[PDB]
Amino acid sequence: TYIVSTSTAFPENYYPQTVLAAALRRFFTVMELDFDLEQIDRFFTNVKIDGRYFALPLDSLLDPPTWGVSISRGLENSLNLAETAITKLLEKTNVQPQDISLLASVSMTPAIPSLDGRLMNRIPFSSTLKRLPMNGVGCMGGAFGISRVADYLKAHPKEAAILFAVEISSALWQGSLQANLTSLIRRLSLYSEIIMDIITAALFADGCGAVLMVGKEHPLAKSGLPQVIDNRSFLVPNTVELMGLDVVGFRNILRPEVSDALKQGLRPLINGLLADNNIESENLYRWIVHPGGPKVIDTVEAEFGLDSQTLQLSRDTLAEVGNISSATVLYMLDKVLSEEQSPPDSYGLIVAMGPGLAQEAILLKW
Amino acid sequence: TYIVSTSTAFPENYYPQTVLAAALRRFFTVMELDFDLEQIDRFFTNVKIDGRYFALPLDSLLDPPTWGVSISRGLENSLNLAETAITKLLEKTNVQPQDISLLASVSMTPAIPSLDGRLMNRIPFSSTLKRLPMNGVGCMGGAFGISRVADYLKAHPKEAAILFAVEISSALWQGSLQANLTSLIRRLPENPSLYSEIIMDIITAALFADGCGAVLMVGKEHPLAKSGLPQVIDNRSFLVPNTVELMGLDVVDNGFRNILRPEVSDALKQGLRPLINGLLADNNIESENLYRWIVHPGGPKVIDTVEAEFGLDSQTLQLSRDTLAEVGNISSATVLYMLDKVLSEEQSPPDSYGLIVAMGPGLAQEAILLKW
Numbered sequence: 001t002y003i004v005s006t007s008t009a010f011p012e013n014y015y016p017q018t019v020l021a022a023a024l025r026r027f028f029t030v031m032e033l034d035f036d037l038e039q040i041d042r043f044f045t046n047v048k049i050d051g052r053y054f055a056l057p058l059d060s061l062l063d064p065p066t067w068g069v070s071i072s073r074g075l076e077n078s079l080n081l082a083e084t085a086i087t088k089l090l091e092k093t094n095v096q097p098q099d100i101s102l103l104a105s106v107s108m109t110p111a112i113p114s115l116d117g118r119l120m121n122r123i124p125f126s127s128t129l130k131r132l133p134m135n136g137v138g139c140m141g142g143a144f145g146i147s148r149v150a151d152y153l154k155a156h157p158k159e160a161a162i163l164f165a166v167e168i169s170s171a172l173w174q175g176s177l178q179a180n181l182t183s184l185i186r187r188l189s190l191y192s193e194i195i196m197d198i199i200t201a202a203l204f205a206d207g208c209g210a211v212l213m214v215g216k217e218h219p220l221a222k223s224g225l226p227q228v229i230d231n232r233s234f235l236v237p238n239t240v241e242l243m244g245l246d247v248v249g250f251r252n253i254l255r256p257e258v259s260d261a262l263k264q265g266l267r268p269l270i271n272g273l274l275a276d277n278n279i280e281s282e283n284l285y286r287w288i289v290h291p292g293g294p295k296v297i298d299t300v301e302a303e304f305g306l307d308s309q310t311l312q313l314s315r316d317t318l319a320e321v322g323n324i325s326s327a328t329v330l331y332m333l334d335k336v337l338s339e340e341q342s343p344p345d346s347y348g349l350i351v352a353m354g355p356g357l358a359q360e361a362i363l364l365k366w
Numbered sequence: 367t368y369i370v371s372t373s374t375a376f377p378e379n380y381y382p383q384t385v386l387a388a389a390l391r392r393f394f395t396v397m398e399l400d401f402d403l404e405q406i407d408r409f410f411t412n413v414k415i416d417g418r419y420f421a422l423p424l425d426s427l428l429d430p431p432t433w434g435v436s437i438s439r440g441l442e443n444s445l446n447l448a449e450t451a452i453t454k455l456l457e458k459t460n461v462q463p464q465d466i467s468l469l470a471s472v473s474m475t476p477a478i479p480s481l482d483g484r485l486m487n488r489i490p491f492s493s494t495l496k497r498l499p500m501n502g503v504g505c506m507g508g509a510f511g512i513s514r515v516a517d518y519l520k521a522h523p524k525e526a527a528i529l530f531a532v533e534i535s536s537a538l539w540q541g542s543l544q545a546n547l548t549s550l551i552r553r554l555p556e557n558p559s560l561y562s563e564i565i566m567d568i569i570t571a572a573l574f575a576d577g578c579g580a581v582l583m584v585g586k587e588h589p590l591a592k593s594g595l596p597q598v599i600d601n602r603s604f605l606v607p608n609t610v611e612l613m614g615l616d617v618v619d620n621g622f623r624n625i626l627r628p629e630v631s632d633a634l635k636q637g638l639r640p641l642i643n644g645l646l647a648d649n650n651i652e653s654e655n656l657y658r659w660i661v662h663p664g665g666p667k668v669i670d671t672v673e674a675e676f677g678l679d680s681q682t683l684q685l686s687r688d689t690l691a692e693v694g695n696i697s698s699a700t701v702l703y704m705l706d707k708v709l710s711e712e713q714s715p716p717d718s719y720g721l722i723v724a725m726g727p728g729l730a731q732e733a734i735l736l737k738w
């Protein structure tokens with residue numbers, strides 16, 4: 001199974017992290033919330049993000065629209081970004097939509113029917129297009145989706161598939177964060193809850209990524225493209241409460257313990273996958289690690305004894321676009337394929353972590 | 367790919383359809399809503415359902431709990447039913463959880479992480495279990511799940527997979543239906559166009575129910591792949607262009623709203639015959655030689671439409687009507703309940719062909735070709 005090409009799509013408004021921090025400080029100031037505002041600045045700086053794309057508005061932070069309207073805009077933005085990314089992908093590869101056998105999607109955006117079904121009215125896919133709409137995987141979704149498409153293409157060596165991941169984190173800013181922070185600060189053991197919501201506001205951003213993958217018999221399956229040679233999943237027992245998304249609007253759950261609980265899954269997962277492919281982690285030329293946060297990046301480095309430069313792509317990505325959740329690893333893979341040189345027959349590893357607590361690893365070979 | 371076994375799981379409270387109709391009438395009356403109460407009886411009767419399982423309380427009609435409490439209850443009940451069904455499936459097949467390679471789930475219950483991930487803490491699956499949590503498919507999810515798992519097992523002939531589907535339709539009775547019907551009826555005098563909206567919500571209240579089905583599927587080289595079992599020999603999807611608005615589930619201010627427009631049955635015709643005719647033709651089969659049909663009963667009109675389109679004798683879809691009467695429309699789980707009934711029927715004649723058909727949001731249709 002071969003990764004042939006990638007693309008990304010972002011909304012029009014890129015906000016410097018300092019603008020975002022200032023907007024939230026305005027909110028605390030207007031609502032007379034008793035909390036150190038330097039905590040807002042400290043967390044927005046310490047996540048090491050230079051700016052983020054928000055598809056949904058910031059100008060209405062003090063007067064958010066209704067929940068129904070925010071869901072409607074989030075759905076429309078998700079569809080628009082996904083259409084843009086898919087159309088760029090087909091164009092750069094000169095592939096016709098009718099020649100795509102499977103369209104796989106990941107997104108936390110509420111969509112029944114799913115985003116991939118809706119896109120069939122915007123792009124002239126065949127009416128018998130196979131679809132793989134996935135959810136419940138959060139930040140892990142991009143890596144997760146690549147593994148699922150690879151497993152499909154193992155049985156369909158002649159076919160082509162598109163995976164896309166899109167998330168609208170800015171939906172958080174349409175009332176959920178405002179209400180929750182106001183209530184928590186006013187009742188202030190709740191200090192950690194306020195910190196978590198501030199971290200959520202500092203970290204998460206919007207965007208979309210897409211990947212074209214083909215089986216070994218497809219005409220686009222050529223040497224020098226990354227090959228998915230194996231993949232594996234891991235779920236750490238009894239960690240459901242550490243990460244996820246609770247409907248309340250909604251609240252992002254990201255407990256401080258997450259980075260430590262990752263150690264329980266990372267090495268069992270990756271070391272077992274590599275051993276079963278007769279290589280060691282030190283054989284890997286390229287790591288593509290989802291930047292859940294600065295501490296996640298540091299933990300992966302420590303667990304595998306990596307040099308300070310090996311995960312630089314995770315840090316640069318986080319600086320450039322923030323944590324765009326499931327889409328992040330696709331953006332990163334896009335950077336590798338577009339801007340970087342990969343030695344022939346070198347090995348790469350995609351790693352992502354998300355709610356469950358779950359981790360996903362994909363072994364690549366050029 | 368072989369279908370080895372099936373199981374179901376239902377909550378403890380089964381309500382007669384007449385009690386449910388009376389509960390909604392009581393809500394209209396206590397709220398003093400100016401709507402013809404006989405329309406509730408009409409639709410609760412015309413869906414041809416005798417009773418339904420409700421996991422969530424009927425008292426929430428008059429005293430709705432908070433949105434978060436209802437979501438938490440829905441999640442807990444989804445997990446409990448799925449665990450029961452999976453455990454019954456593993457016990458009846460004498461299969462250890464560690465020998466399951468893939469666990470696929472379909473459900474509209476909001477769950478991040480997905481229900482299949484949470485179940486790994488209840489059932490000793492191995493930590494490297496592969497998961498396939500699908501969503502955005504609604505009533506079609508059962509048949510859709512079968513197809514995706516069959517596609518997976520094409521590439522993994524020695525592996526075993528479990529699919530489960532679970533839906534808690536009674537969540538709409540925890541405040542969404544009450545809020546929407548109230549607003550729609552009260553705005554009706556100034557806006558007559560809202561009448562069809564009120565009927566739709568009444569139909570939703572009449573039709574959808576709770577439950578769970580699960581299926582064990584294995585690849586051709588698995589030791590459980592034996593001749594008597596139904597084999598998935600092909601499957602196909604279809605999506606009808608420009609029909610998103612006819613069926614789905616929207617998140618709104620009132621909570622959730624189920625969308626099911628009267629035009630669905632007619633739009634069904636646009637997809638059903640190209641889908642099924644093409645699937646059958648590509649496998650050198652004609653519909654008249656099908657031994658069995660397993661058609662998701664989206665409604666009585668849906669059943670009649672499938673019957674008419676394929677010129678079926680009206681006993682051919684009797685299992686759709688019997689299922690609707692017994693448990694109502696339990697959405698993605700329904701075809702799994704139906705398949706479980708079939709596997710308790712007379713040993714299907716060897717080399718007999720069967721077709722699973724289900725329709726759902728998109729508007730999308732899924733057809734699966736079985737051979738016994």
Ligand SMILES: C[C@@H](CCCC[C@@H](C)Cl)Cc1cc(O)cc(O)c1
Pocket residue numbers: 071074107108109110166167168169171172204245247249250252476477617
């Ligand atoms: C829009 C919200 C809605 C919450 C779930 C409610 C439904 C299951 Cl009923 C989810 C979301 C969060 C996020 O951080 C990025 C996204 O793309 C999407």
